[PDB]
Amino acid sequence: NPSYQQSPRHFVPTGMHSLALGTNLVEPLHALRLDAAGTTQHPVGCAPDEDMTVSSIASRYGLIRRVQWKKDHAKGSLLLQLDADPFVEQRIEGTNPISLYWFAPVGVVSSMFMQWRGSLEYRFDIIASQFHTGRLIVGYVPGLTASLQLQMDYMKLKSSSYVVFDLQESNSFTFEVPYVSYRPWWVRKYGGNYLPSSTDAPSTLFMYVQVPLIPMEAVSDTIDINVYVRGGSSFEVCVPVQPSLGLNWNTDFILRNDEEYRAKTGYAPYYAGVWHSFNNSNSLVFRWGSASDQIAQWPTISVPRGELAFLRIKDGKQAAVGTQPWRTMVVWPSGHGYNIGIPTYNAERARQLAQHLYGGGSLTDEKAKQLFVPANQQGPGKVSNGNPVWEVMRAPL
């Protein structure tokens, strides 16, 4: 029967569709259901509750801070200076190297997006009797750079969009955080996984004490200020990219490869002690012996400009011991021809030291020497469990 001899169709081979996209297009595949019209229905009992919207999430109010307000708080005093951006953290204590963090529903997103451009808000739940009275400030001042984040009083805050709250028989209030930028949308503050590919927050709000609290003798003077954060009337979200937040399921990291940071061969074990050449024996530094100038020599850490470095041990059950396990430390040259391991209280105090040494500083400055651990913390002076693994943390500065 008849020959279709007219020229056949043309066609250009691809291999697979489609790791993107999925907004509006029909995706053909091989369904393992028995039917070609097999789409699951949702019965009256199997009710579709949500409402799976980026907005739906960025509207729940998640806790993020808790400030203790006291009568002792001066007329001129601040309570929190937390960042006005969705990527506002809350560190949770312990214990493994990488520290876990609390994040509002407006934190988990846009952890998935690049830009946001939104308006936000903070609910300040002030647990208070009717016999507690005070006044709090709160001001979104755009253009808060690094150094300029200090040099900040409650008076210059009154220069930008700010609010004062009177509390007698009305506990909480909600401040909507304005969005002042030169840029339409706002890129990630935390960019994962990439160090220099992360731009700071557009601004921050503070909560000063406009008027100190006056508590009558039958109600306590200290009071908790719980703080919640959610996307405001128009927190927008722009473009899906690599998430900046991880699981909570398996908080492990197989240390490649095997570039585990640990003391130079021969400097083990090592306890926290003192040294006449390190702040005149007034602060703790790792020593591999009790004799003359036996200070633990540590490998040099090659860090690219615009970053900082410190150390957190893998197992706390192998760290050197004083009054507490020195799980955190900072590494910097000692001038006597090597690098020394300087134990810190916690990761924050190790970071802050890296913010000052990599910020083009010295060791004999008062700003750094107030982050060094005092020598009365040396404790029983237990040595480590050999030369346990430390991992090198990284952060922009």
Place this chain on the structure above:
Amino acid sequence: NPSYQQSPRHFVPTGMHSLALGTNLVEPLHALRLDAAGTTQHPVGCAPDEDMTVSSIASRYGLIRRVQWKKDHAKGSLLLQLDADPFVEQRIEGTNPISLYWFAPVGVVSSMFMQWRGSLEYRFDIIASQFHTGRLIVGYVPGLTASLQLQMDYMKLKSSSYVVFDLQESNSFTFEVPYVSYRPWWVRKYGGNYLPSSTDAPSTLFMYVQVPLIPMEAVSDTIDINVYVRGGSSFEVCVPVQPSLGLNWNTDFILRNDEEYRAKTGYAPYYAGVWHSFNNSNSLVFRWGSASDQIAQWPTISVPRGELAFLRIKDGKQAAVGTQPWRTMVVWPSGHGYNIGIPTYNAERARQLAQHLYGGGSLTDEKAKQLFVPANQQGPGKVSNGNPVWEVMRAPL
């Protein structure tokens, strides 16, 4: 210009269409004509004569038998007992191994089909003067098995659908063959190329002499009865399969591989002679010598149950010679510890012997010993041309 980004089509690779089919579907290919609308037309002179129908063919009347009817034919006598099915043969004489056969247009088809289910008919052209008178019978008796094909008189035929024909001044007549089966359609009688995959005919018609002929002295007593066969009013045809008939162009067969049947090494040449141990020297058997018990020993033929075997030589110009070239023979064990070559008159007499030995018989039965070639046919007793090639024929039983 705009991007068609919606998911591309799916598709499942095959390599070729289509060794079947061709009833109603458009077949795309690469035509070597100059035009994409190139279909040959058939002018008024280039008239399309046929009418290419399976029916068109099974309506022409082809000859198939010739019976000589004589006054000497008794009141109780048969003329032909040919098979009532489209696969009705007519052997043509000579000469090569595989014998050629004549087949009506209703024979060549359904040689291509598996089943037929049709009604057929036979034109009995009786060449006769007006001074010849007689009466013939013809009856389609369904259910004619092997043994029951004999034990058949003209009287029990009158029990099934039968017809009697009076002839004075009316020569020929046409009998339409009924179709009585349990099966709707009827599978091939000859299945090629496959031995046990062939089922016998549903029934057969006979042509007895109801009344012997009475010829006046000026017209001869013997008369020819030509017989033709064609598909009747409703010879149907069911399903195309492997043809059971071959060419006529090149009637050769390259003998594989090279399993040519021939006498055991050392029994050559061999002439037809007699043997005191083979029907008491009353019949011909191949001998490789004239001395004591020099009987040609032949290889054993492994035949599967439901089949029979005999032999036809390749070249008649190499066969043993008596009164005629013994081109046909049958092989069976001799009891004296080997198999003997028993020459037959023709292929039919070799088959009929295989119908009796493979039909669970013996050699000392009268039914077989009337198929053995008499010893006065030994002739000048020419030896063969060495040990020429025989080929082993096969047929169901």
Place this chain on the structure above:
Amino acid sequence: NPSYQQSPRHFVPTGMHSLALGTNLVEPLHALRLDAAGTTQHPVGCAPDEDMTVSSIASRYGLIRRVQWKKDHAKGSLLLQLDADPFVEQRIEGTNPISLYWFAPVGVVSSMFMQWRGSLEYRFDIIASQFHTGRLIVGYVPGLTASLQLQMDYMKLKSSSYVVFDLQESNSFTFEVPYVSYRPWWVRKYGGNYLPSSTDAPSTLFMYVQVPLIPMEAVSDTIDINVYVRGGSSFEVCVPVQPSLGLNWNTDFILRNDEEYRAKTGYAPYYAGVWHSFNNSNSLVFRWGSASDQIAQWPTISVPRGELAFLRIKDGKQAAVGTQPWRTMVVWPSGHGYNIGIPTYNAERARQLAQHLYGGGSLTDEKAKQLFVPANQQGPGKVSNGNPVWEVMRAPL
């Protein structure tokens, strides 16, 4: 978004479309133009002149013959007997082996087609004064075989469709050539490139002198008859196949492989001379010496039945020399136990000899011995330039 799970389409891979065809079908490809609607237009200045029709070409009148008509021409005489078919040649003089040929526009086509079936016509431009009078005949006699092309008078031509032309003050006339065949269309006379795949012309026309010319003393007695040929009112053309005509651009042929025809090793150089054993020294034959029976022995040419063979040298600047370069020759056995090189005047006289020797003839016939070159043409008897290359020509007979 929704799953197109219904079975994908089927499809049968080919690799390329389409070396044919191109009458009416859309051909998809990759056009290198910047646009997907890029089809060149033809402006008013860039006018499309032709009219590219097979008919358009087979309507121009191209010259093909020139006959000199003279008063001396008898009452019974012929002027040209050229072939009545589109493949009518006109050899042009010189010089390389393969001779060039002139062909009318109705010659170049159907050199591309297999069959033609057409009616043709010849314009006989007779350059004549008004003081020249004569009468010419012209007759298309179908069925002109080889031998029957002679045995042809102007009288038996008057038996077929023929025409007589009176000329006083009317020079030229046009005769339309009828088409009488048993076959609808007419296959190629010249089939390239294939020797036995070429069937002769259906017939031919002649131009006899019905009445000799009578020229008064002040106008010359010889007169030119120019002859033109073009497709007539209905020269049809049937089916495109391999062209039977070549270029004119590069008239070379790299001689494979390297089967160049040349004398047997040791018979070089060789001049044209005479031999007592070759027409009793009355004709030229190639000799490799001046002494007893030094005749050039040439390789045997294996020619299939229905063909003929002769020789044309590659370079005329290497041929043997007499009165002219013997560039053409024929090869045939000499009876004295070898084959001899017999130089001819030209290629036509070499072909005509092959038409007589391969036409089952001998060497001692008068028909062949009038094609042999006379011995007074031996000239200064220059030897060849060694054993230069000859190539073996082929033609059907």
Place this chain on the structure above:
Amino acid sequence: NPSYQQSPRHFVPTGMHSLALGTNLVEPLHALRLDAAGTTQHPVGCAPDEDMTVSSIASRYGLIRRVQWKKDHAKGSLLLQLDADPFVEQRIEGTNPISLYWFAPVGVVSSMFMQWRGSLEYRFDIIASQFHTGRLIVGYVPGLTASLQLQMDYMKLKSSSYVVFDLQESNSFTFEVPYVSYRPWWVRKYGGNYLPSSTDAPSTLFMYVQVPLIPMEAVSDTIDINVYVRGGSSFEVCVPVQPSLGLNWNTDFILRNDEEYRAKTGYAPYYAGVWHSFNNSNSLVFRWGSASDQIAQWPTISVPRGELAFLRIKDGKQAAVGTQPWRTMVVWPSGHGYNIGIPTYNAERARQLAQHLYGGGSLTDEKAKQLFVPANQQGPGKVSNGNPVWEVMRAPL
């Protein structure tokens, strides 16, 4: 469920679409956007300014020449004879080998196209007081070949389409350049990257001084004539091909391979000096020594006919030194059996010499010897930095 058994579709495999084209056709691909309807919109702020037309560009007036007109300019004098074609250059000074060039917006296109066919125009901005008066000519004379570009007065220009401009209190004027060709469109003058594939300009305009300037004592006598060029009312553009202009970003060229032109092994270092056999010591030529006939022998440059060759050094900080770094030179045979390095002032004077030596000239002609560098330019005669790399330039002639 039912079988689609009808013959599947045919189809012819390609691999990729489509390096061309993109006028009007839908291009399917794999878009990395999240949506299948993702086409970027252009907001009211993100306004689409241009208007991206080949015309839009060839309408801006870019500077190309600056002529200083002076009272001293005679009644018969020319000011510029620049080429009337879009590929009109303006060399910018320095410094690397390949010299950079200034090009109008009507220069950058059609640097991308093959042909143009357009009408053009020149704005002659004449910075002048009202106390300056003069008259300028300007004439597009088609058919200006090489030699005929000189032998050109302001009088024969008045023979072709020409214009005279009166200036008192009206500074500038605009002359629209006519387009007179035999060819509809006009192919590239500069064809990149291919030497002989570039045809010269169709014609040129000149700007003679019809009437010398008459400046009163309180306004200066010399005056700047800035010249701009843009596509006129109908500068057309024909067909996109390889650009004849490069980047400006990275003006480097990795010298293949490594066929860097430099003096023959042993002729290093080499300073510019004089030679009694080179214009009788009146001009500079490279010498590898101060003694008898120590002239730098240079490799022969194989240049195809229709081209010329000279040399520009890679680093000027390695060239031989006189009054200036001899960064440019020409190479030609010296007759004393080798080729000599003849330093020139600049690249133009090296080209012009190649225009005269490759223009079938000699060395002892006055036309060439006025391009040779005088011997008072030999300077302190610093030698080179070894045998630094020169690269061989090429241009048609």
